[PDB]
Design a protein around this nucleic acid. Sequence first.
RNA 1: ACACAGGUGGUCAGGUAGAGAAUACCAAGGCGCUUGAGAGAACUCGGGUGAAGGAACUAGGCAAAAUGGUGCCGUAACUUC
RNA 2: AAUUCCUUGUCGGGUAAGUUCCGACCUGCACGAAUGGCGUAAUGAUGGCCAGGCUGUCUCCACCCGAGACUCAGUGAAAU
RNA 3: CGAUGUCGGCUCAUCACAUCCUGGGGCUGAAGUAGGUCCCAAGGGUAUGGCUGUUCGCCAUUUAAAGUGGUACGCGAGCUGGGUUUAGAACGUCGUGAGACAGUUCGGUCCCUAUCUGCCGUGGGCGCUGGAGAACUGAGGGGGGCUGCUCCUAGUACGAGAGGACCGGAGUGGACGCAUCACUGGUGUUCGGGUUGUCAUGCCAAUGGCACUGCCCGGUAGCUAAAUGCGGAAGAGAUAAGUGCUGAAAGCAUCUAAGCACGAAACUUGCCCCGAGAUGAGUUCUCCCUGACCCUUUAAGGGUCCUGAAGGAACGUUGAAGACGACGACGUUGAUAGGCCGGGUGUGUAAGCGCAGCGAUGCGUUGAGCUAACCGGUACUAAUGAACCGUGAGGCUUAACCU
Lengths: 209, 122, 56, 120, 114
Amino acid sequence: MIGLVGKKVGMTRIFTEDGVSIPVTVIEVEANRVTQVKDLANDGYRAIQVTTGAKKANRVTKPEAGHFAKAGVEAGRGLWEFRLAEGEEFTVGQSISVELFADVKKVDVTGTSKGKGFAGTVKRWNFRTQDATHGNSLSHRVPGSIGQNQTPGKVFKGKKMAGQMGNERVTVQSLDVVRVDAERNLLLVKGAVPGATGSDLIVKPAVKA
Amino acid sequence: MIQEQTMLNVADNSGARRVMCIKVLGGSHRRYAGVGDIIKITIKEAIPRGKVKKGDVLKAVVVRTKKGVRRPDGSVIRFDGNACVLLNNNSEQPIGTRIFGPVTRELRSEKFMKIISLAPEV
Amino acid sequence: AVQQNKPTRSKRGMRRSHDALTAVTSLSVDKTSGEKHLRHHITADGYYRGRKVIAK
Amino acid sequence: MRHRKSGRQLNRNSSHRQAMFRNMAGSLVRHEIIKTTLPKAKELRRVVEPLITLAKTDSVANRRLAFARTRDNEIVAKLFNELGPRFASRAGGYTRILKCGFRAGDNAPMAYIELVDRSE
Amino acid sequence: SNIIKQLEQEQMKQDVPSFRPGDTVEVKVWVVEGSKKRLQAFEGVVIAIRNRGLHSAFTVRKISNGEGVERVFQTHSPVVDSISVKRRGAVRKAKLYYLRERTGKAARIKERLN
RNA sequence: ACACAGGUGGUCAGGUAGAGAAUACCAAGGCGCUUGAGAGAACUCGGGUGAAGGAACUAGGCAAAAUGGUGCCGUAACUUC
RNA sequence: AAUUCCUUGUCGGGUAAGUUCCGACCUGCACGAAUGGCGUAAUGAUGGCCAGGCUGUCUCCACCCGAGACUCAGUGAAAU
RNA sequence: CGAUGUCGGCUCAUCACAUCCUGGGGCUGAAGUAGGUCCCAAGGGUAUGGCUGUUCGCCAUUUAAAGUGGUACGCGAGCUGGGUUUAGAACGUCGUGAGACAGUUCGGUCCCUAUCUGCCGUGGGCGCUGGAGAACUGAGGGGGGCUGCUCCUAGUACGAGAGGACCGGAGUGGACGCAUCACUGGUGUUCGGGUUGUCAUGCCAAUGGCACUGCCCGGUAGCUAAAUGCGGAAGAGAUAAGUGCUGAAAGCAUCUAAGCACGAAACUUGCCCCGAGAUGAGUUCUCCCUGACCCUUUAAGGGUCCUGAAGGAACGUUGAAGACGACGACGUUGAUAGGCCGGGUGUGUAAGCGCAGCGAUGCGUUGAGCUAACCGGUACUAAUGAACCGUGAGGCUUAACCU
């Protein structure tokens, strides 16, 4: 039954009686404003706009605001939509909380993975460094070969080369919920989710059991 | 780490005290050995009063390391150096009649029965 | 060869098509001086927002 | 990119960045407004602002404070005695920056940095 | 997000002492072995202690000759039963690392008496 | 070739430290390396610190590293003593 | 072996394995006593080997710093 | 032969299937457990150490397994440079000798400022038919497709006995990827303290400059493995080898012909990501623009009057954005960022003051003094009120309904 949007906000530890530290990702979920339920409005199916929040009244755009203008003239900070099949719904001014998961198990999350700028090689593709002695001919952090002599006359498509990390999401599927607290905005999930503290996270039930 | 050419202390009686690691056992492409794991070890000085000879290669279990353990109790436990127990070349389990210093209990395989039962370690 | 044939004069111009001369738009007019300037810098006559910040 | 570690690097070593902005802060106390490059104007603050905050609270004696720097007889006499009573009522915000185009083309970006209280 | 700054305080233990390097505090742990719940004491000197609040670090070393053991305990760990407080030490280093390579008569410290 | 990290007989010998014309700080005296300004990418030249092991590296323990002062004790085999 | 092709010979010492080394055997394609034959004090920024020490050589690199790089305003080449 | 650099090695590829290991099937001179053998199969997995300059080879230790091979027996404007193949000299030996030796021993040169394609990352211009914003759909692509031990089945079937199984769910490691700094190590030239020599302030104190961050010990933020967590699922579709039913050619028989179901770790999907320049530019929702005059062979132009939205950029405060761009929060209808204040972590009890001691120095007033990134308060400082682009309902045909 649908999914929710929130923010990573940090890494934390579970304090288990197994003595291990065990990471848990906080995931802070303000109640999603559910500003529209659709009735056959495109492609012959039913959907709901979940709406992550609102925007500051001094920094609003007209083509964004019209998507939420019946609920408020302050946009939504997330124009996310989900399929409606497990229920029948109508549009009201009551936001949905993490209580949506109080009887649910096993979830998947879309994050905002590691922004590293340049990323390089040793921290992009786990490359190794070449022999640093017998005299080194400007060849300490170099890949070795990138291909083979003359016959291909090209590098292969999908070769590992240096290139940035950032402007990416990543989706992680080995997660389950711990806190589900609709009074603390606290979802809390088992393990470490992609991205830094400011990463915006989308969560739904996983099809892998 | 407990890796190649590492010099070690033997937790076994009557022979010599110094022994050297040459490789890690069990699984593919193996580097480094943890506490409760198996290595192949050389008898570096032997002494004529022990049950093994100099330059022979035996099997041993890692029981102590200077970085020690951090997964079973979750908090780090560290030793003063590095030691292993020395197994009988055919019958397995420890070759001597005494084992020196504290010993692991984290390994579960019944081929180590008489060292995973040691009450002084719990 | 070091180059196989010299490049066409089109290629020179296609680089210049991404090399737009910064010339700046929308010049601000000062509230006390007879000068125009860039919105967040001082005028050549020592005024900013019509305030006399420096002598001339 | 090292953007989570916050702070402007601005040229050479922390010994020259000490000596130059300490010399230029001495010159700032003379003229109360200085023209220099826009990056230098932002880092000059880090010598001047602590010497104004050192005079923010009025307390007797201890004129030994900071007395290994800004000890020139033409400006040392303004420490506490003018750096206090010209800014100690405002509660911070001692200085403002204003850009002034470029240098001689020689296209270095220039700015004027002033104190919010100036006297002639 | 203030929830992190809540959770790092609302989990703090309420029968734990404040202690220093060179002290001996007789820490006890449950071992978590078998269904017959154990209790084990670890004897030795404190080499590092505090501060991170709930998260505070706490490491003890046996300093026995010729060989001994060093263990991390952490003052709010779920597996710690008690910190008992036994002896003091007169040491000024916040990390006792000059002692962490000693076990003989060079490892004897004054027990903070006057 | 050029206003180029070069060549280059002779004269002179302050103070603290040091054995010293080493080297470290300074006089008298001289100079600010005559293209610069931002940015704070890898990679790269040159530096600083480094877990748990150790030559397992390399045709070569190459390169790096340890040692190191300056007073006294002590000091093998081999020897033509 | 600073000399011996098949041949990485043999044994003792030795290494986890040694076409390494040292010693022994003579089982040296034509080593052999003034270019000597063989030992050998002293000398070695010395080849072949060992131990002891020490390590970013390595496992495997992690962070920190300057000066280039990057970007900008000016001066402005060569092979082709 | 007016040069197209080598063997092996480091480092990294790509393909074959004659399959080293994985899955399926039929035999065995296969009781059970197994091994070997053959018929289908290439997505996934495929040694380390030593001697050697060395492929190959041989030796050591192991593994699920240590595949058989192609590519100029791949990979030197990628790295190496021992053997090779010279500059010098030496041992053996032929010859009177210069000299020579796929005979031997040491010493010993790896230069280059990348073109067009490309590959990895990243922008700008045009077009989608009046201009923008954001989703949905999925034509399409990328990611990815191993394995020891241990439990249960069960000490059951099987077997005097020794010994001992299906099915495949679960735990736990290995290899290989993926993600994370809350942990734990290390670092920490934006923090504090200790200190050698000397220079400054006339001297001393005290504080600072210089000398590798001068030397030394801890360390926040930030980062990152030596630290931490997690995978490649269930199901569906369709197959070759192959197992069978029903049954004919061939009145019998038979698995194939008709008819049909099953059958693999591969294939088509499912999953996860990206994807409409998918010009084949869809579909939908949201937003913006509602002005005419004159002239005529015009899905077009000529003259003239008035006139400047949406959104992005500019502009500058700047972030958990960063090579530059690009992204993003905020911009006075102002917590976007400092200053000031406060808290958090780190450092460690100072100077001034008083006491003890001949003094170095110590103690106490003083849990002192100091301070950065961690995250709150406070408009004290700066992002002003604008402006230049971007416009005025947007062509033609057919079907329908109104006219």
